[PDB]
Amino acid sequence: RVPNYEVSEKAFLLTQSKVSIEQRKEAAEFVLAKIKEEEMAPYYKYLCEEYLVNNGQSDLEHDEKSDSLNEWIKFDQELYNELCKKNESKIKELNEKIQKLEEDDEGELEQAQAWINLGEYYAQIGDKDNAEKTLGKSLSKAISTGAKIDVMLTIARLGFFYNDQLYVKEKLEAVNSMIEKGGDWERRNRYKTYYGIHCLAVR
Amino acid sequence: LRPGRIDRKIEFPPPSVAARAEILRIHSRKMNLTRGINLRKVAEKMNGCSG
Amino acid sequence: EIREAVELPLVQADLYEQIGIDPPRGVLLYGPPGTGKTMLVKAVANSTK
Numbered sequence: 001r002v003p004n005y006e007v008s009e010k011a012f013l014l015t016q017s018k019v020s021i022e023q024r025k026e027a028a029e030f031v032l033a034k035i036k037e038e039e040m041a042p043y044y045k046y047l048c049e050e051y052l053v054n055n056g057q058s059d060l061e062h063d064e065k066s067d068s069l070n071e072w073i074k075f076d077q078e079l080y081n082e083l084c085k086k087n088e089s090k091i092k093e094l095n096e097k098i099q100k101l102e103e104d105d106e107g108e109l110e111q112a113q114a115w116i117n118l119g120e121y122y123a124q125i126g127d128k129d130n131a132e133k134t135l136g137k138s139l140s141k142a143i144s145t146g147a148k149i150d151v152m153l154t155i156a157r158l159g160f161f162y163n164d165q166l167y168v169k170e171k172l173e174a175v176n177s178m179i180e181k182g183g184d185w186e187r188r189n190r191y192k193t194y195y196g197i198h199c200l201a202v203r
Numbered sequence: 204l205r206p207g208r209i210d211r212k213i214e215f216p217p218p219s220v221a222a223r224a225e226i227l228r229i230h231s232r233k234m235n236l237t238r239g240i241n242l243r244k245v246a247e248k249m250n251g252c253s254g
Numbered sequence: 255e256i257r258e259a260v261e262l263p264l265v266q267a268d269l270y271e272q273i274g275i276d277p278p279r280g281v282l283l284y285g286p287p288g289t290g291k292t293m294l295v296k297a298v299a300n301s302t303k
């Protein structure tokens with residue numbers, strides 16, 4: 001939940017070369033700490049692209065420019081190794097739980113809660129496509145109206161991560177349908193802000 | 204209350220603490236709460252004596 | 255109890271609606287008429303306008 005935007009906010013500031021020298025080097029520290037600890041490994045490869053002509057770059061597997069104005073940028077091979085390991089591990093654990101929920105009937109509430117956890121991991125690693133798929137199975141099992149609304153917001157959030165305004169816009173049409181089915185004022189405030197931020201993103 | 208005139212007699216007690224929570228939960232669907240409020244907690248703050 | 259009952263649906267009815275309390279209805283005032291029941295109605299009416 002918490003690194004997903006906070007890493008993106010600092011990573012945007014870091015990209016620019018039209019910021020202050022000081023502000024870019026403060027940001028850069030928060031970004032880098034969080035890749036290693038939280039396993040933001042695939043979005044980190046992605047972010048090496050996003051400079052390109054802007055400076056800072058000092059990566060060991062991805063392009064560098066002649067002018068490195070930053071050094072709180074590094075690619076390490078340990079990052080790649082970790083990925084491979086952690087990936088299989090999380091996948092293996094939950095899977096088996098899902099099969100267990102199939103054997104003895106419990107699969108309405110708990111298998112969707114397992115697949116929510118799978119999209120949060122997928123989302124963590126920076127995959128919008130495969131987070132969304134898992135968050136798709138969560139729907140099919142019959143759950144509360146509250147849970148269904150919460151899930152669509154999460155998917156739309158992954159749109160903000162890659163800064164794709166259209167990806168936000170499309171998902172937030174579907175929430176407009178369900179919002180009055182649940183009828184909550186709680187998840188309507190969330191809706192007001194979710195939309196808030198989306199409307200702020202366009203002109 | 205003479206013979207054969209009344210043949211089923213239904214006593215109704217004051218509410219249980221499980222039953223008093225189930226009346227509270229019906230009323231909470233009209234209202235908009237905040238999550239983390241247990242209405243089993245509320246039913247135990249109360250003791251009631253009627254519905 | 256009167257500022258809840260009379261004054262709150264005039265200033266805005268929708269305050270009730272959005273919390274999800276449905277509004278109280280009618281007010282009965284009872285008592286000896288020497289108690290200033292009648293007096294209270296005139297007091298809040300001049301005030302709410």
Ligand SMILES: Nc1ncnc2c1ncn2[C@@H]1O[C@H](COP(=O)(O)OP(=O)(O)OP(=O)(O)O)[C@@H](O)[C@H]1O
Pocket residue numbers: 286287288289290291292293294295
């Ligand atoms: N709280 C008070 N402060 C000042 N004067 C008061 C107070 N309560 C009542 N009085 C006075 O006592 C009188 C009677 O009050 P009011 O005019 O409200 O009628 P009431 O009791 O409903 O009578 P009925 O309904 O039988 O006509 C009024 O002159 C009122 O100003």
Ligand SMILES: [Mg+2]
Pocket residue numbers: 287291292293
């Ligand atoms: Mg009077």
